[PDB]
Each structure stands twice: as structure tokens, then as C-alpha cells.
Amino acid sequence: STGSATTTPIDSLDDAYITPVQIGTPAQTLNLDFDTGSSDLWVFSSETTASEVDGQTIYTPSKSTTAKLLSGATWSISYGDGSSSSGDVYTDTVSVGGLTVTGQAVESAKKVSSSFTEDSTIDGLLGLAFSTLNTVSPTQQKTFFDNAKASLDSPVFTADLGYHAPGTYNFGFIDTTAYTGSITYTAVSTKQGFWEWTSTGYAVGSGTFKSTSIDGIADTGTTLLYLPATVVSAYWAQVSGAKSSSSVGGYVFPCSATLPSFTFGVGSARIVIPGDYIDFGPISTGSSSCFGGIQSSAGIGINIFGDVALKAAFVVFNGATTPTLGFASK
Secondary structure, eight states: OOEEEEEEESSTTOOOEEEEEEETTTTEEEEEEEETTOOOEEEOBTTSOGGGOSSOOOBOGGGOTTOEEEEEEEEEEEOTTSOEEEEEEEEEEEEETTEEEEEEEEEEEEEEOHHHHTOTTOOEEEEOSOGGGOOOBSSOOOOHHHHHGGGSSSSEEEEEOOSSSOEEEEESOOOTTSSSSOOEEEEOBOTTSSOEEEEEEEEETTSOOEEEEEEEEEOTTOOSEEEOHHHHHHHHTTSTTOEEETTTTEEEEETTOOOOOEEEEETTEEEEEOGGGGEEEESSTTOSEEEESEEEOTTTSSEEEOHHHHTTSEEEEEOSSSOEEEEEOO
16 A cells, blocks of 8 residues: 655745644544654544643544544653643544554543644644653654554655645655656664664765764754754855844844755765755734854754754665665755
8 A cells, every 4th residue: 555645834934844644434524744753653632631722723533533642641742942742642544644553552642731722733743763762651652653554555654844845745655756866875874763874974055074973863843954053054154144042042134144955975876955944034013133044953862854954855664674864855
């Protein structure tokens, strides 16, 4: 089997991407944030504290003839940006782009933190990291990908995120028309439960490539590109007026600037992030100070190849017995 679904930016800055997901019988369609940095599929629901729902579409398990309460199971998750959610668990039928999993754990939110409530466009998350990170207790549950894997034509999914435009998540096949040149594959460590890999270096604009190992995670659920302070300082030094602002919470730059590109290495291959992809617009409405899309990972504890990086590539998440990651230009 295979599946193919379009993923759409939630706003004009590509702050996140939503993908429609069918849950239950008859189908209830919710727009979920596909997150290769976590491993829970959770949804706003009829059980979510009413004051914490503001415009989201909810899953109502009592209206699904295939929903079953997973007795005794609870979940609770905290994300890198400080947001969180928790609740109980059902199993139900879940379909993505024509690919159907029966008996998928659907984690129903009883509580969500303010940032989730305040974002009306995201109805929940669909985790695509390794199932070892799943938070369901006392019986850990599998991700959608893990459940689908054996049925897929090939044990892979691909992320093709757009810049200010829709893109595609595919399951079970590689669309050879969706990228240019070749796909370069690179090793993955699953030791921390992430799609963790090592970039071979970087360049700023038309500058010379610096060969240096940068360990980090491919994370569709993180907006920006978080890299070591040395790398980030080298980038922003090429932008007149750019500075790190503790009050704003990162590097800012004059909105009148033309940003240089940023290149990252995948083996001997190179992915170029155009300068415009690094512009996240005014820090507040009407400001002439703009927020940068490349930020320091210092004090996160890990480097993160988030959407800023991933949307410059066609990315293969290869879930073979020994997982790997592939990157192509597009």
C-alpha cells in the first residue's frame, strides 16, 4: 500500500504545516501537524477542557463506531518549545492520503497548554519519530508509520515541504518526479528516539564550505534551523545590522536586508537554503526588526534541522531495519 497527502502552511510565514487526517467511522477529518520529532498522535477532542478549545476541529470518539477506549491508558507530553498536552487513549481507524491503519492509538486531549489553544489551525499532532518516545502509559503505543510499515510497498515516508506553498507527505514510495539530481543517504542514530544524523558542514552565501560534523535531528515539527553558536554567528555576521537580542529571544535583522543563502552538507552533497527562507518577518506588527530563521541551539542541547532546512529538500525517512535519511535538491 501507499498514501499521499498534501501538507499546507498554517500562515504566511510557514510557522507549521497541517495535513488532513481521517479518524474514525464515519470519517472525522482533523488537520494535524506531522512531527518527525515526536511519537504521539494526539487530537483535540470532545474530552478537551472547554475553555482550552478555541476554533479547532475536535474528534468525538462516541460518534465513531470503530473507536474503543484503551482501558487504563493515559498520556502526557512536553515539547521543546515548552508547550504540553495530556489525556486518555482510544484505538480507532486512521487514514492518511488513502493509507489506512486499523487499531491506531488516538490520544485524546483532556488538557492542552495555551499555545495549542491559541492556534486555531492545528487540531493535533501526528508523531513520526521512533515509537520508543511514545508517552502512553502503562503500555507504550506505536506511531502511525510503525503500524503501517509492514503493509507499505517500501518502508519509507517522504517530506516535501513547500516555501510559502503546499507540499506533500508520501508513505510507502519515493516519487522520482519530486526532486532533481540524486538522493544522498546518510546514517541515522535512533539512540535518542529521533531521526538523528550528522551533517558534513556548511557555507554562508557564496562563501567557502566549512567541513565540520554537525549532529542534529530532522524535525518537521520545529519551524526554524537551530545550529551551534559558532555557525549561527558566522551566518549573521554577513547581514549588516543583525544582532542577537536577549529581549526578543534570538537573532534579529533589519527588515530592509537581503539575506544570504545557507548551505548544509549531506555527505558529499549540498542543500542550499535560499536567503528568503530565513526571513520570519517583523518581530511585532509594524516593526522594522525582523526575526531570523537560523538560531543558536546553545542551551537546547541538540541541533535541529527544522522546517527552514527541510523545506529546501526532498527528504526520505527510510524506516528499513537499519534506518537512514535521504536528501535531494528540488
